[PDB]
Amino acid sequence: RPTFYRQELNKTIWEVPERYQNLSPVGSGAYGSVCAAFDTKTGLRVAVKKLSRPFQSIIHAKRTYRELRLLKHMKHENVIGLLDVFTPARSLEEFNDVYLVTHLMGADLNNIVLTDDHVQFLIYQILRGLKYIHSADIIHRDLKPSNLAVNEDCELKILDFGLARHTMTGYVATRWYRAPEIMLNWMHYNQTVDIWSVGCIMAELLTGRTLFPGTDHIDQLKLILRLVGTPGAELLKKISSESARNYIQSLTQMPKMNFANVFIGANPLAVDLLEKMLVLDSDKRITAAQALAHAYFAQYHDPDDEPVADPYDQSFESRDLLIDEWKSLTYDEVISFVPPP
Numbered sequence: 022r023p024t025f026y027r028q029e030l031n032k033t034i035w036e037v038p039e040r041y042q043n044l045s046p047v048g049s050g051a052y053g054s055v056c057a058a059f060d061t062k063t064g065l066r067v068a069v070k071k072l073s074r075p076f077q078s079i080i081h082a083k084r085t086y087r088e089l090r091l092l093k094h095m096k097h098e099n100v101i102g103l104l105d106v107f108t109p110a111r112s113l114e115e116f117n118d119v120y121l122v123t124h125l126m127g128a129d130l131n132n133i134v135l136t137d138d139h140v141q142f143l144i145y146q147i148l149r150g151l152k153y154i155h156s157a158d159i160i161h162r163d164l165k166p167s168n169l170a171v172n173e174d175c176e177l178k179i180l181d182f183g184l185a186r187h188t189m190t191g192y193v194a195t196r197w198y199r200a201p202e203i204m205l206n207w208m209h210y211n212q213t214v215d216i217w218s219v220g221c222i223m224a225e226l227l228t229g230r231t232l233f234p235g236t237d238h239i240d241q242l243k244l245i246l247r248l249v250g251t252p253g254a255e256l257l258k259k260i261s262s263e264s265a266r267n268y269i270q271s272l273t274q275m276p277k278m279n280f281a282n283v284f285i286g287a288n289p290l291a292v293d294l295l296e297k298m299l300v301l302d303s304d305k306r307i308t309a310a311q312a313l314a315h316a317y318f319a320q321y322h323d324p325d326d327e328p329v330a331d332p333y334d335q336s337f338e339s340r341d342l343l344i345d346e347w348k349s350l351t352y353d354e355v356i357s358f359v360p361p362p
């Protein structure tokens with residue numbers, strides 16, 4: 022057991038191992054406050070997130086469990102993983118706090134504001150990371166610039182995947198980058214919700230503008246159909262909702278724009294890949310693996326260095342347990358954590 026020390030940082034008491042020094046608030050992450058810190062053991066800069074009231078309710082407790090399990094499983098360069106997890110609790114009965122320690126990247130894509138080459142490298146990394154999480158049947162669901170962490174090398178990791186509700190978790194998504202299908206629940210969804218997000222992000226990297234800055238669900242939908250065209254009979258067949266079909270066919274029928282007119286003077290391959298990401302029909306949207314093999318990524322693509330993940334057990338997601346059952350499960354996961362080399 023390590024030596025802990027306490028420290029007031031903006032409202033709450035942080036209690037952390039002495040190996041972590043110079044704690045420095047950097048605002049909110051998902052479900053808690055994050056400090057940058059210096060790890061004296063490794064000489065690394067790290068992000069430390071203290072979860073906010075992890076066991077206050079079934080939602081908090083389950084989501085504490087989910088986040089921890091997610092982090093422990095991720096071993097991939099373009100996906101955030103777990104350097105350390107600690108609690109100041111000496112036993113289960115006083116277990117009330119969970120701290121999660123990862124690499125500290127130093128910026129995000131939301132700050133960034135980029136030549137065609139940077140876009141290539143950056144989107145390549147997103148897709149490579151996405152291929153890895155999709156293979157373990159984990160989906161991000163709220164991929165967006167603010168959770169794409171990058172360092173001054175343009176190296177990139179994805180954060181905050183697996184947290185947004187499947188079909189509550191208390192996680193707050195950002196409208197502008199969501200696949201229309203999961204925003205309007207208008208048709209079943211799959212892993213390619215994240216590919217739409219990649220589309221919106223890639224578009225913003227090339228033009229400087231948010232592609233679809235809607236003020237609500239309906240405005241947003243209006244902006245999307247202005248680009249991609251109102252769907253024909255083929256896609257309209259696949260939508261159950263009487264009202265979603267109403268909206269689509271009631272807005273004046275929009276023709277599909279030429280993507281070369283919108284993403285002016287972009288690499289034609291960039292344009293082409295956008296055309297394959299930003300299609301309304303989820304069954305026809307390009308996957309992460311297929312997008313990696315696209316010609317736009319020829320300087321970066323390597324079939325033997327685009328790994329998939331080991332099988333991730335998430336049968337727990339379908340379980341309705343008490344807070345204390347989730348808590349014990351979390352505590353087990355904490356006690357059995359082995360650091361990386």
Ligand SMILES: Cc1ccc(C(=O)NC2CC2)cc1-n1cnc2ccc(N3CCN(C)CC3)cc2c1=O
Pocket residue numbers: 047048049050051055068069070088091092101121122123124125126127170179180181182183184
């Ligand atoms: C610590 C941590 C734990 C877990 C996870 C995570 O992805 N979990 C899911 C299972 C995938 C992520 C992080 N993490 C890592 N580095 C960061 C670096 C900076 C920041 N800010 C910087 C900008 N400010 C305005 C706002 C916030 C937050 C973070 C941050 O939340």
